[PDB]
Design a binder for these strands. Structure first.
Ligand SMILES: [Mg+2]
Ligand SMILES: [Mg+2]
Ligand SMILES: [Mg+2]
Ligand SMILES: [Mg+2]
Lengths: 196, 94, 107, 609, 217, 252, 390
RNA sequence: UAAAUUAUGGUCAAUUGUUAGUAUUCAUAUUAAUUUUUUUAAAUGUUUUAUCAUUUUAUAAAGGUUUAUUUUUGAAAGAUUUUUUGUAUAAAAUUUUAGGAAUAGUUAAUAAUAAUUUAUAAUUUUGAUUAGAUUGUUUUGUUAAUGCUAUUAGAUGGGUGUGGAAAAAUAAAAAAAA
């Protein structure tokens, strides 16, 4: 008979430890939650805990798993997962550093669909060639700083507009007028005179 | 496993317990263990003069012993003159 | 100079350096100051060390004393972890109170 | 064991790597240094089967293997394969060839429109042949071909190759040598720890140290540059020396019994081919002298003199005095040709070693002559004359301060004294070689012959025991030949040379082997004991696994690390390009009942039915 | 980035490359430059002991490492004790001196490469046919070749202090092996190494025993 | 950043010069223990080979500025026990220090005096060994020591060796003189210029033996308690020299 | 192999290099020997044959040409091996010596097959019949003589193969001794080719071996050669070749259509050569590899009428007797049928006198590529039309 | 808006039980488990040594960790010797809470180990930090099911800086130098 990968995994478990974990863990046990705070006065400003919470990273329902099949896998032959990436430069505030936002794929088997999530990386540029908006290809490398382990291998698409603005003396990208809130309370404007 | 056992025993030079040694003695891979001793006969007693006399009576040739240990330890797939002649090209050399 | 060398692994900056090219975006005043003040500070420090021997010696001795007396001088796994508060976040609060946050960068 | 170099080359190939020319050269050189000519040929076959075009350095290494093995067919095949295009350098050309291949890189357009197999770069050695052959070491290839033809006896081909080499070296400029490559060994900078023991760490003996040497060298080594650093005329001298060396090697191969010092009476006298061999060597030497005029006076010829003396000592049975006279005549002829006045050179350490070897050959003998006594010497041997010549030549060498003595030279002196029976070889060894040299057991092998001649067996026994104590002290373990020589006189001396443990092991092993050989029931082969079946990390046949698809109730697909499942068994989110091709057609499917997962081409058409 | 546009981008890249090749073409070959070293390598950081400024594999020999050398010979008047007394002899030391080296550089090379406490023990100067060579002049001006006979005349009173701190193996690559007294040219071979020991793989990857199955790659 | 330039393997370590236990003090007998074998090896070499600058007409003369820089490591021999100036003299009367010169005195040349010269700044020590009498070893006519009146053969010659006060023993160590030259004394009998050539006769065959070696006295096993198997205890055959595996001469 | 000094050669440089004072050799035997030496090579000998110091486009063109030469030589090696195997099989089955099989005929084949069938070896008889039938097609010694000579000429033109046929260590079959023969048959054969075949470069370009500059220059040389051989008073001035009045004999090299045609533009009618013979005008146009450009390339009926009217205006040829027509030629080669049509229509030469003028024409046996059907249909419908009058 | 072309001159079917595999009982479950008439069995002295000493004897303290924790290595293996022998640590994806907001010994550069400097720094509404719960990566149960429901892979800064490597003061079936 053809044995599924569960059989091979159980074989590995039996080899490492005498026997396999077949003990019939009682999944029907009644889990309970005994409240300890007031009705709405839970001690947290962000999330409030009022029932049994899910545990585990890959045991979360609905399931989310990595999806290696994407543009990076179509283009590059990665020696290791996430060794090569392609993204856009989204900041050059730090000296000799370029921030790159890349995309990866998360798979939801229950809904049978995939989504593109975004991650930021601190790529390294030595001669200060990267401009915001450049489509860059980055590669893993040694540890450069506390959060720098990528470097800009090549610049696929330089931002001509950004370079021309820098030559003209303006910022490469004008700062956005919107952004992050400083508080939950609405930040109201103060159009008052000095007397008032 | 035979290939893995020979790899770990010869190349990696791993240790060996007594129960596995007895089991492999049954299997024929290894001679009977040191502790597989009967009470029928006691341990041998060695005498230097007798040992030297026996060695002098039966001492092997230097070259013969060297060839034996070379075959046992180094490569045993030594080509003969016929194999060397067959390997040598005879056709128009291109 | 826009492409890295796949064979050697050199980046586009290394390729431009080897070819003698120059790919440097127009630098702003703050960036020019960043690239220019290093030499100024080095000269200031060297001048101070050569001009005030007793003060520099006292400062260096105090710095060496604190470095040598530090509790975590040994370079074990915990000291070699690039991000201690993030990696060993179990210790924060209950045992270690130096860091009030377990996350400081995009990792 | 020497087989491990070939094993590691095979492992490198199996682990999906491309063995570089440096790897092939190292494998061949290690196997040649271990004497595995067949394994070196196997390495060359591996290189050919990898579809790798050898560089000129690899060609030179393989031709060195061929000339050492004495097989000309291998070298002829190699020449016809990868050596019919090599040419010498012309005066109107650039000496170091510029680098041609720019390192592999991909542009923006190519990174997208090229397939992955075009975009993939593994270090294929065939792409670096042009930039490795940029130094034009073809003269060494021609010298190797001349050597292999001389070894094979093809006199016409050897003459053709040597004439081509000579006409190149006398009329063409010197190629630029390739610089040494320090990027081949991962060697740490300096020494991280400065602790270093003294040379007198052990109070019982002087010992060498990693910083400086204090025990003196055991072998004489000529201090000379490499062939690639030699000039054209210097390389011509080197080629003449190498041809003479190949002549000597072929002579020794043809007559192995006539070259060992103490085997039989055949060693003493000349062979029947000595006159022809000496005539050929002398003709070659005179040809070199005629070709090189006054320019020869400015060329290092110590190696040539040493090989000439070795040839005229081994091939021709000449005396040490004759060898010294020949070396002096060579030096004075060189000075006269150079038109120098009172500025001749001196014999070097290798030349004096050859002279001392000639004296030892004169004083050689056959041990016991297979008669338990009456050692047979050479007919017409004069111990007084030979010892006087040895004494005066040794005094000359000692008076010359620029010759550094070595263990081999002292061994020659001790052997000559033993052969002449001066009863002072023991004193010479205890005064000159014992304390301040890393002497081997051959010194005591011979010193036992002198010890046998002591008037009293008690003195003989005491000398033998003191020699054994010397071996125990100065870290010179007794050789098997010395131990057997002492064993053969056990009835007279009653001195033991085998340890209790060794004898106890040997008795049981010999009895068991005799019993096993006599027994016929256990002569049958045992498959569990005779061989190793399969030693590769992966099975040799497809048993069906992996599946690369999930099944019912398996949400986790692909499994990621340590799981061969690559996608969900039945339905998946839309894929693109090669991923879709693999998921729909190409990936393995164990549960398919019609056909198993197909083999790669062309291993599929033959199992169609 | 969206993966559905990969085919369209490949088509556009092919068209752009073809237009570039058709119009711009290639205006003559360009001399290949020797590649440098890359700071960004994979894996954990390496110790400063092994940092040899080379983090990639390159079998070929780069142009900067190439050097032009001349096989010069320097002869010294030595004295050996023959059975009668002292007799004059010539001792020749071989050096590889660069074509653009001065007489002072040749003298320094001789001092470094003598490797004998009898030739360069005392101070000396180089001459040809008795005429002293100017230490500030190069070999090209003097026309010195391998055939040229360069003699060395020594002053017994002045002793040559060992002021040489440059290693004899020093080169542009700066990969110098300490405690090595053999000149870089005298020895050149793939000599076997006896200090280390061969190492085999002990930790298995995936397969541990029993049935292979997939192998867990 | 600066923290991730290199890992922390193989850090910079303090040199042995600073460490007190590493360096050797001249007052201690270990200094003489280190320097005596070098002296005897140098004398043995000079008795058979001409060393170029081992014997000088007068003490080496250098300007006082360069004296401290150049003198350390220097070593040369002179006739008579004249000592350099600007050097406080301390004779070595300690038997613990003198014992290391015993072999040199007995086998090479009778050692008469051992002195240590300390400079004004106490930064450049000199060791002076004065030997009385002719060389015990045979001396070649071409040997360097043949020049000295008191060596080849008043009758006293001095050896001066300059070093630094507090240094590791490697600074004292001298290895340039470890050159081995043959002694032709046992071979001088057969030389052409020797009138003893027609005296010795070559014994080319071993004489016939009628008796064996004398049997050894009957082995008496030891009586006192032994420590154990020296081979299992990794002790060399007598605690002195040899190999542990090849055990011999240890109570059995 | 590939060297820094190595560079591609032209026909003039090939003639300058490969020269012989005189003498006549067996060209067929020399060709067979050289081809055997080529077949004796391993795949590694084709690796380093492109000179490095060249622009990338030129290197790519050289690589394509060398790959084409290697492919053609491999195909001929397979054909030669099949021919030899068939000859050996026929000799073994019949018993005759291996040399007479080429001279045996169908009657002998019938006799031998009847003998085998009578003896009961129906399988051997069928194999013999098949071998002889397929051997009749490729059994001639000079089966592809012209193409093989063109391949060897291309190898010589590459300039990196002339030294690849010498310095071989060989054993003398008679005395059984080793030597190194320095005799290079490749140089002898190339010298013989350049000495005898004066239009070997034209044949080489017509067969499609020239990947760098096409075959238009060779076509112009061929046409002007025919024009001069006909007129005997031909006068040339740049890209226009004219006869000395009398009968009109005009050849005009208008432009190169490959560079003249521009993609994405609208301009119908671009001719390469214009030939006026008597009162007839022929527009010789070389097709392009782009099937969408051929329609632009072919001029319209109005354009042909206007060109004929201009010819009448300039040369004074009366409008009553004036004919004009097109002639489409294959893009990358020139097949035997196209050459024959060119000779028949343009130069008004019959096949017999054309073969009398040109010796290599009768052995030129290149046919159209079966793959390109668009071009074949266009050429048929263009060459099967009548002359446009007035 | 192609207009009914004509030897109809071959009809005689199908089934022989043979296969390309998730198949559905609205629930009372011949599904899993806890719960009633009270389930048992094994132990605690490591050894050696040159003798008030030295040598050999290295993750189950469990805590409360969701951008997290990942590692054998200078000892041993180990071989008639270098001369230490000897590149272990780093990345990518996946990460909980009915009543959702700011976080901070901070980011990068550096001739700066042990930062007196420079910067328009870094984190986060694509869900951060703090607080709550919970040992992370096909192992259990159930179903026609890519659904739902379980799980001690037992893993880490002040106690000695020893050791190749801290994990070093409960245990956990283990042979430790004749
Ligand atoms: Mg918490
Ligand atoms: Mg994570
Ligand atoms: Mg070890
Ligand atoms: Mg979260």
């Amino acid at each position: 008979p053809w044995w599924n990968f569960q059989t091979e995994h159980r074989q590995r478990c039996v080899l490492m430890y005498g026997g396999a974990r077949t003990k019939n863990t009682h999944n029907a046990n009644h889990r309970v939650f005994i409240k300890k705070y007031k009705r709405n006065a839970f001690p947290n400003r962000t999330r409030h805990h009022w029932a049994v919470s899910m545990t585990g990273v890959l045991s979360q329902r609905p399931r989310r798993m990595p999806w290696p099949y994407d543009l990076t896998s179509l283009i590059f032959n990665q020696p290791r997962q996430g060794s090569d990436k392609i993204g856009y430069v989204v900041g050059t505030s730090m000296l000799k550093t370029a921030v790159v936002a890349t995309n990866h794929m998360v798979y939801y088997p229950k809904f049978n669909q995939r989504v593109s999530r975004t991650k930021r990386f601190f790529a390294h540029d030595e001669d200060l060639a990267c401009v915001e908006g450049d489509l860059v290809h980055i590669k893993q490398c040694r540890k450069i700083s506390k959060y720098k382990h990528y470097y800009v291998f090549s610049i696929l698409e330089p931002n001509v507009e950004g370079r021309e603005r820098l030559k003209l003396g303006l910022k490469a990208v004008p700062p956005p007028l919107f952004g992050y809130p400083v508080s939950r309370r609405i930040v109201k404007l103060n159009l008052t005179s000095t007397e008032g | 496993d035979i290939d893995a056992f020979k790899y770990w025993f010869g190349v990696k030079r791993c240790r060996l317990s007594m129960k596995p040694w007895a089991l492999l003695a049954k299997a024929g891979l290894l001679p009977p263990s040191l502790t597989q001793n009967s009470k029928i006969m006691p341990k041998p007693l060695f005498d230097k003069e007798s040992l030297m006399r026996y060695y002098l009576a039966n001492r092997k040739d230097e070259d013969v012993m060297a060839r034996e240990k070379y075959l046992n330890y180094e490569n045993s797939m030594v080509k003969t003159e016929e194999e060397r002649a067959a390997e040598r090209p005879v056709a128009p050399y291109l | 100079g826009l492409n890295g060398c796949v064979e050697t692994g050199r980046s586009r900056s290394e390729v431009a350096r080897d070819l003698g090219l120059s790919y440097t975006r127009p630098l702003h005043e703050n960036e020019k100051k960043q690239l220019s003040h290093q030499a100024v500070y080095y000269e200031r420090l060297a001048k101070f060390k050569m001009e005030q021997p007793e003060a520099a010696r006292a400062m260096e001795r105090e710095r060496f004393v604190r470095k040598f007396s530090g509790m975590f001088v040994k370079m074990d796994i915990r000291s070699g972890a690039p991000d201690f508060p993030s990696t060993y976040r179990r210790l924060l609060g209950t045992k270690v109170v130096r860091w009030a946050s377990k996350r400081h960068g995009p990792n | 064991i020497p087989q491990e170099a070939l094993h590691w080359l095979l492992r490198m190939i199996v682990d999906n790597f491309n063995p570089q020319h440096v790897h092939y050269i190292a494998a061949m050189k290690t196997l040649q240094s271990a004497g595995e000519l067949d394994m070196a040929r196997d390495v060359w076959k591996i290189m050919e089967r990898q579809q790798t075009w050898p560089c000129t350095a690899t060609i030179c290494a393989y031709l060195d293997v061929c000339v050492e093995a004495g097989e000309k067919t291998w070298a002829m095949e190699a020449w016809n394969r990868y050596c019919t295009e090599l040419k010498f350098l012309e005066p109107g050309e650039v000496d170091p060839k510029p680098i041609s291949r720019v390192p592999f890189s991909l542009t923006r357009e190519e990174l997208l429109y090229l397939p992955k197999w075009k975009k993939h770069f593994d270090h294929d050695p065939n792409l670096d042949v042009m930039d490795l052959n940029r130094f034009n070491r073809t003269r060494e290839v021609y010298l190797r071909m001349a050597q292999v033809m001389l070894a094979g006896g093809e006199r016409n081909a050897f003459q053709h190759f040597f004439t081509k080499l000579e006409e190149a070296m006398l009329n063409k400029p010197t190629p630029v040598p390739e610089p040494p490559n320090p990027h081949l060994v991962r060697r740490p900078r300096w020494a991280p720890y400065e602790h270093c023991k003294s040379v007198h760490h052990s109070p019982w003996r002087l010992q060498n140290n990693g910083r400086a040497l204090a025990l003196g060298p055991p072998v004489t080594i000529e201090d000379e540059m490499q062939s690639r650093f030699f000039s054209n005329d210097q390389f011509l001298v080197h080629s003449v020396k190498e041809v003479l060396r190949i002549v000597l090697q072929e002579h020794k191969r043809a007559h192995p019994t006539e070259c060992t010092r103490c085997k039989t009476e055949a060693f003493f006298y000349k062979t029947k081919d000595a006159d022809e061999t000496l005539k050929f060597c002398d003709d070659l030497i005179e040809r070199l002298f005629a070709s090189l005029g006054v320019r020869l006076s400015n060329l290092n010829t110590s190696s040539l003199l040493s090989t000439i003396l070795e040839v005229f000592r081994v091939v021709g049975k000449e005396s040490g005095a004759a060898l010294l006279q020949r070396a002096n005549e060579f030096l004075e002829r060189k000075a006269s040709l150079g038109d120098a006045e009172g500025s001749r050179e001196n014999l070097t350490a290798s030349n004096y070693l050859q002279v001392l070897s000639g004296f030892a050959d004169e004083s050689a003998f056959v041990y016991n002559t297979k008669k338990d006594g009456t050692c047979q010497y050479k007919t017409g041997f004069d111990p007084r004359t030979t010892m006087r010549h040895l004494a005066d030549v040794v005094q000359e060498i000692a008076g010359n301060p620029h010759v550094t003595w070595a263990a081999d030279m002292h061994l020659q002196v001790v052997e000559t004294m033993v052969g002449c029976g001066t009863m002072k070889a023991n004193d010479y060894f205890v005064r000159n070689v014992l304390r301040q040299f890393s002497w081997d057991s051959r010194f005591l092998e011979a010193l036992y012959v002198e010890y046998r001649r002591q008037d009293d067996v008690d003195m003989w026994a005491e000398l033998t025991k003191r020699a054994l104590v010397w071996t125990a002290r100065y870290n010179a373990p007794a050789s098997e030949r010395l131990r057997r020589l002492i064993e053969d006189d056990y009835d007279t001396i009653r001195v033991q040379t085998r340890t209790f443990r060794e004898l106890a092991v040997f008795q049981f092993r010999d009895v068991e082997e005799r019993r096993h050989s006599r027994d016929v029931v256990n002569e049958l082969p045992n498959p569990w004991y005779d061989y190793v079946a399969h030693a590769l990390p992966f099975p040799d046949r497809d048993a069906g696994y992996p599946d690369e698809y999930g099944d019912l109730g398996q949400w986790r697909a692909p499994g990621g690390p340590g799981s061969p499942v690559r996608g969900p068994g039945y339905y998946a989110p839309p894929m693109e390009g090669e991923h879709q091709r693999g998921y729909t057609a190409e990936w393995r499917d164990l549960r398919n009942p019609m056909r198993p997962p197909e083999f790669p081409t062309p291993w599929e058409r033959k199992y169609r039915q | 980035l969206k993966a559905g546009l990969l085919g369209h981008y490949q088509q556009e890249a092919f068209e752009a490359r073809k237009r570039f090749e058709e119009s711009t073409t290639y205006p003559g070959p360009i001399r290949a430059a020797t590649p440098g070293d890359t700071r960004f390598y994979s894996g954990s950081l390496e110790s400063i002991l092994h940092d040899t400024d080379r983090h990639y594999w390159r079998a070929v020999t780069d142009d900067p490492r190439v050097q032009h050398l001349i096989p010069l010979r320097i002869r010294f008047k030595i004295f050996t004790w023959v059975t009668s007394g002292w007799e004059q002899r010539m001792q020749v030391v071989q050096i590889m001196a660069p074509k653009d080296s001065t007489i002072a550089q040749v003298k320094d090379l001789v001092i470094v490469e003598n490797q004998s406490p009898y030739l360069c023990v005392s101070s000396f100067h180089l001459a040809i046919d008795g005429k002293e060579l100017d230490p500030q002049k190069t070999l090209g001006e003097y026309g010195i070749t391998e055939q040229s006979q360069i003699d060395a005349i020594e002053q017994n009173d002045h002793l040559l202090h060992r002021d040489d701190e440059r290693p004899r193996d020093w080169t542009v690559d700066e990969i110098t092996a300490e405690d090595v007294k053999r000149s870089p040219y005298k020895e050149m071979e793939m000599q076997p190494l006896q200090n280390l020991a061969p190492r085999y793989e002990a930790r298995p990857k995936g397969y541990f025993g029993r049935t292979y199955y997939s192998g867990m790659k | 950043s600066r923290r991730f330039r290199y890992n922390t393997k193989f850090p910079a370590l303090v040199s042995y010069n600073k460490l007190p236990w590493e360096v050797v003090n001249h007052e201690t007998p270990q200094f003489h223990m280190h320097v005596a074998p070098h002296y005897e090896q140098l004398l043995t070499l000079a008795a058979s080979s001409p060393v170029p600058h081992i014997i000088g007409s007068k003490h080496i003369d250098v300007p006082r500025e360069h004296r401290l820089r150049l003198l350390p490591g220097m070593l040369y021999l002179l006739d008579g026990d004249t000592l350099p100036g600007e050097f406080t003299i301390n004779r070595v009367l300690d038997p613990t220090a003198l014992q290391y010169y015993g072999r040199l005195s007995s086998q090479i040349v009778t050692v008469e005096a051992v002195r240590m010269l300390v400079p004004d700044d106490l930064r450049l020590l000199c060791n002076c060994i004065t030997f009385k009498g002719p060389l015990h070893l045979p001396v070649a006519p071409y040997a360097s020591l043949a020049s000295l009146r008191g060596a080849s053969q008043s009758n006293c010659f001095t050896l001066y060796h300059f070093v630094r006060p507090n240094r590791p023993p490697k600074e004292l160590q001298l290895e340039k003189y470890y050159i081995h030259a043959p002694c032709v004394a046992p071979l001088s009998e057969f030389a052409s210029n020797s009138d003893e050539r027609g005296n010795w006769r070559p014994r080319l065959q071993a004489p016939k033996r009628t008796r064996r070696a004398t049997p050894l006295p009957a082995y008496r096993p030891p009586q006192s308690y032994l420590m154990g198997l020296a081979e299992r205890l990794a002790v060399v055959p007598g605690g002195c020299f040899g190999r542990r595996s090849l055990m011999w001469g240890h109570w059995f | 192999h590939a060297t820094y000094g190595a560079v591609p050669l032209t026909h003039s440089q090939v003639t300058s290099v490969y020269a012989t004072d005189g003498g006549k050799v067996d060209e067929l035997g020399l060709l067979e020997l050289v081809e055997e030496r080529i077949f004796s090579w391993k795949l590694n000998k084709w690796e380093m044959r492109i000179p490095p110091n060249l622009p990338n486009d030129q290197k790519e063109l050289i690589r394509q040409e060398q790959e084409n030469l290697k492919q053609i030589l491999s195909e001929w090696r397979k054909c030669f091996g099949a021919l030899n195997a068939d000859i050996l099989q026929i000799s073994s089955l019949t018993g005759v010596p291996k040399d007479v099989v080429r001279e045996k005929n169908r009657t002998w084949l019938q006799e031998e097959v009847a003998k085998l069938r009578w003896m009961g070896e129906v399988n051997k008889a069928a194999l013999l019949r098949d071998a002889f039938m397929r051997l009749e097609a490729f059994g001639s010694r000079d089966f592809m003589f012209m193409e093989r000579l063109c391949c060897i000429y291309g190898l010589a033109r590459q300039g990196t193969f002339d030294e690849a046929f010498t310095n071989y260590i060989t054993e003398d079959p008679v005395t059984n001794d080793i030597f190194v023969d320095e005799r290079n048959p490749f140089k002898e054969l190339v010298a013989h080719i350049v000495r005898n075949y004066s239009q070997i470069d034209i044949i080489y370009d017509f067969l499609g071996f020239n990947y760098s500059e096409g075959y238009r220059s060779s076509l112009r040389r061929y046409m002007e050669y025919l024009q001069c051989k006909t007129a005997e008073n031909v006068r040339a001035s740049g890209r226009l070749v004219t006869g000395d009045k009398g009968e009109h004999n005009i050849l005009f090299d208008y432009c190169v259509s490959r560079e003249s045609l521009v993609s994405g533009d609208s301009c119908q009618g671009i001719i390469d050569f214009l030939y006026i013979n008597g009162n007839d005008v022929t527009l010789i146009i070389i097709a392009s590899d782009n099937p969408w450009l051929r329609n632009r390339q072919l001029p319209h009926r109005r354009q042909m009428e206007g060109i004929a009217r201009r010819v009448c205006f300039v040369l004074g040829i009366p409008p009553s007797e004036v004919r004009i027509r097109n002639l489409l030629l294959p893009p990358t080669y020139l097949d035997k049928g196209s050459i024959v049509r060119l000779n028949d229509i343009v130069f008004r030469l019959s096949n017999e006198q054309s073969n009398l003028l040109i010796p290599w024409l009768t052995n030129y046996n290149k046919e159209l590529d079966p793959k390109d059907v668009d071009y074949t249909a266009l050429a048929k419908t263009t060459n099967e039309e009548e002359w446009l009058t007035l």
